[PDB]
Design a protein around this ligand. Sequence first.
Ligand SMILES: Cn1cnnc1C1CCN(c2ncccc2-c2ccc(F)nc2)CC1
Ligand SMILES: [Zn+2]
Length: 328
Amino acid sequence: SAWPEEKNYHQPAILNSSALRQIAEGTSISEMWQNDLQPLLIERYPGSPGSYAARQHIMQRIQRLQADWVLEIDTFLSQTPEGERSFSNIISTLNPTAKRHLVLACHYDSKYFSHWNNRVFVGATDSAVPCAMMLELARALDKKLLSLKTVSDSKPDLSLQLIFFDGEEAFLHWSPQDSLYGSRHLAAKMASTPHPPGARGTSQLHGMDLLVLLDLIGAPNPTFPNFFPNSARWFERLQAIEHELHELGLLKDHSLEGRYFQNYSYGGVIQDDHIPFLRRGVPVLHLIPSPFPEVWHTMDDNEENLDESTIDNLNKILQVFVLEYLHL
Ligand SMILES: Cn1cnnc1C1CCN(c2ncccc2-c2ccc(F)nc2)CC1
Ligand SMILES: [Zn+2]
């Protein structure tokens, strides 16, 4: 049918002030910090013990929730500059046979570097915080997301998916063949896979309303450009949510002159896990700052250099965004 075009006309169900206060009060940065983030602050490049531990951690944290998440592990082999390696994308889906999903994503691998001093790269912004933000969103909205389990003809056929990509980082020199291992694999698989099952023509990529990719988040004073015109209206919703939460007194250490979501765009093309989706026509909201964090790809990309209030603030904005999108 014309269902793959529904995303083009889809509108948010905007939350009122008292709902905004409830969402702000319902997320806990200290609980995220201890229970979702700190266990991921480990070396976790492909095939390392930390890769397996990261995956177990993400999966166990989703499995304890009441909403009916369906977990799948998309495991495959690829040649790399270091020789053949195994990669595992984690896909967590509410209502897997719904035609449409809003997709939130990040990479859970860490870049490989040799141990300078007695120090290891743990990629706190890149992307342990994004992962933790997705896990906290799933926990904080769990009661609301539990209502998607209820079938109803008064609601679009739309639900939520989380993707935690493996192998985003280059092993040696970033290039088309050394980078994006997980996302290139998963976009190709999805493009090839009928959706809904038994359909003619339409693939799982037609089902992706919008790919919201979080990356390099956790530094103070981030500035996110509005990268793409086909997601500019959704970006402007993040600006509006930020502004309203500010005005209601629900953000912390936040000024309108230091706001995160900016009017301007970006002069180049940033390569990331969204590329294999974007080149096949999926709309993307790329929540990556420009400039990148000062600590990018250094041993100082660590817990000490994260900003609690910034991440808390962004948690509130993202949670509101997702509820508005899904009409919850
Ligand atoms: C998105 N992301 C996460 N961590 N690093 C990145 C970007 C990915 C794209 N990047 C590059 N793009 C084109 C050519 C080279 C790079 C690059 C990638 C990795 C690296 F370590 N150095 C340069 C910059 C870093
Ligand atoms: Zn990186």
